[PDB]
From a paper:
We observe that the equivalent valine 128 in mouse [name] is part of a large hydrophobic core comprising I43, A45, A47, L69, L75, L93, L96, V126, P129 and W146. The structure of the ADAT-[name] complex was refined with good data collection and refinement statistics. The same crystallographic space group and unit cell as well as the similar resolution obtained for both WT and [name] ADAT complexes allowed the precise analysis of the structural changes occurring upon the [name] mutation. Superposition of the complexes showed that both [name]-N and the ADAT catalytic domain are mostly unaffected by the mutation. We found that these movements are mainly propagated within the [name]-N specific structural subdomain but much less in the FLD, which displays a more stable fold due to its tighter packing. A bulkier methionine in place of the leucine at position 128 will have a more substantial effect on the [name]-N structure and we expect the movements observed in the case of the [name] mutation to be larger in the V128M mutant.
The eukaryotic wobble adenosine-to-inosine modification is catalysed by the ADAT ([name]/[name]) complex that modifies up to eight tRNAs, requiring a full [name] for activity. Our structure and associated enzymatic and biophysical analyses reveal that while [name] active site catalyses the deamination reaction, [name] active site is inactivated by the replacement by a valine of the glutamate involved in proton shuttling during catalysis but also by the capping of its zinc-binding pocket and the loss of [name] recognition determinants. Our results show that the [name] N-terminal domain adopts a fold that shares similarity with the ferredoxin-like domains (FLD) of other [name]-modifying enzymes, yet with an additional specific structural subdomain, containing V128, which forms a loose interface between [name] N- and C-terminal domains. [name] N-terminal domain is essential for [name] binding and deamination by ADAT and can rotate with respect to the catalytic domain formed by [name] and the [name] C-terminal domain, without affecting the structure of this latter catalytic domain.
Numbering used by the authors:
A (entry chain B): 25 to 150, 162 to 237, 270 to 349
B (entry chain A): 14 to 174
The structure:
């Protein structure tokens, strides 16, 4: 059992700010499609494509009514009438009730907490983060990383495993575990994998070895590995459990900084059940 | 054995600056560096990122690998060597290299100019002295040595890209 949690900068982790808008009840439900067409042609709401325009409501009985999102509120968010908000003949307002103010999420949700908060005000687009097909693929790649970590454990190496995947073809480009030794102490699993991707790449290649690729690593990368991924320009990282000195969520979030020339997505929790019994990085 | 390498700081940083200029001529970020153990150079490196097509091959990583080869060939343990080695580098180590230097337990870094884009000794993050109990040991810095020359190399490079 597992769930993928995004790891965002502290800025993007809080609550989305709210903006005020006008909605109106749809009293004649059979006007809904016409009203939606007429109003959204006048007020397309280009800055808020995450908002559905019709809010269904179920009554304490099962009866369903609907509100229609008309437009954003101006600088003076006073009471407004249908005649004040909707031009004729561009809109025939018959079937709408009196407009009311509603606060709306200004930007689309990214976390589950944000999605719940958002849809408490108004229906918002995304239920769950990953499709069944996606979760199956992610589990398969993390299982391969777990298996690499367990091979390392059986040999007496630090039990960290990693897999690099090209999500264009879902093919595995590299599989590695920690190989650090007394003679070679910096062979962390991510460093091994980056060097594997490097050696298998073409002649007219840029040094941004990981551009476009996904990384699955059993536990959260240390500062060295995390910043290697910034320099190599990984596109997404999935990890299982945090590390105490981890730099993709725990002590730092170097993937989500404005002053580094590359940002990327990070999710924790993938197969965390198994990964938490493996070794932290370093 | 650490302060004995410090005595020749001027000679060691001149060699680091010489290497930084080479790197610049070879279309690499102009960072040169030397690792000195008991007044002898046990490793050196300049940025080899574009040469090797590998974003992790910063000067400091190249020099660390040379010292490790030196330790392997002469049957010395990295611990005894790295813990008494000074790194001389023309530019503040980046976040990645600062973490590698902690993991190697290098006690002292003498560096030239600040690293505004990626610096891990204070410019972007303070990896060098951070409280990271599972990530090696913190190290100390002598910053600013020939920073003016060193940062002029950096600006020259970043114009040419
Ligand atoms: Zn690491
Ligand atoms: Zn570096």
């Amino acid at each position: 059992q597992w769930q993928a949690l995004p790891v965002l900068s502290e800025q993007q982790s809080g609550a989305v700010e709210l903006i005020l808008a006008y909605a109106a009840p749809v009293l004649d439900k059979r006007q809904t499609s016409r009203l939606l067409r007429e109003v959204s042609a006048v007020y397309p709401l280009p800055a808020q494509p995450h908002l559905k325009r019709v809010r269904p409501s179920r009554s304490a009985g099962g009866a369903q009514s609907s509100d229609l999102l008309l437009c954003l509120a101006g600088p003076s968010a006073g009471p407004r009438s249908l005649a004040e908000l909707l031009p004729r003949p561009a809109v025939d307002p018959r079937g709408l009730g009196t407009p009311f103010l509603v606060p709306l999420p200004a930007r689309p949700p990214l976390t589950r907490s944000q999605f719940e908060e958002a849809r408490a005000h108004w229906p918002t687009s995304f239920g769950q983060l990953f499709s069944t097909q996606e979760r199956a693929a992610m589990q398969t790649h993390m299982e391969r990383a777990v298996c690499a970590a367990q091979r390392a454990a059986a040999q007496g190496l630090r039990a960290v495993g990693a897999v690099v995947v090209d999500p264009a073809s879902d093919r595995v480009l590299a599989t590695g575990h920690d190989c650090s030794s007394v003679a070679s102490p910096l062979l962390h699993a991510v460093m091994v994998c980056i060097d594997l991707v490097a050696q298998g790449q073409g002649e007219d290649s840029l040094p941004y070895v990981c551009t476009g690729y996904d990384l699955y690593v059993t536990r959260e990368p240390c500062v060295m590995c995390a910043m290697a991924l910034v320099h190599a320009r990984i596109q997404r990282v999935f990890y299982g459990a945090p590390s105490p000195d981890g730099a993709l969520g725990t002590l730092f979030r170097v993937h989500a900084r404005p002053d580094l020339n590359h940002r990327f997505q990070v999710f924790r929790g993938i197969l965390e059940d198994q990964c938490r019994q493996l070794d932290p990085d370093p | 054995p650490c302060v004995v390498s410090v005595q020749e700081t001027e000679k060691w940083m001149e060699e680091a600056m010489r290497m930084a200029k080479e790197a610049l001529e070879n279309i690499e970020v102009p960072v040169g560096c030397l690792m000195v153990y008991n007044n002898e150079v046990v490793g050196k490196g300049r940025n080899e990122v574009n040469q090797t097509k590998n974003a992790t091959r910063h000067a400091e990583m190249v020099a660390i690998d040379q010292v490790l080869d030196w330790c392997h060939q002469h049957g010395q343990s990295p611990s005894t060597v790295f813990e008494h080695t000074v790194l001389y580098v023309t530019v503040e180590p980046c976040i990645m290299c600062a973490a590698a230097l902690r993991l190697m337990k290098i006690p002292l870094v003498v560096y030239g100019c600040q690293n505004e884009r990626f610096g891990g000794c204070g410019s972007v993050l303070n990896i060098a002295s951070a409280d990271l109990p599972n990530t090696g040991r913190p190290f100390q810095c002598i910053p600013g040595y020939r920073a003016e020359e060193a940062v002029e190399l950096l600006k020259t490079f970043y114009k040419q890209e």
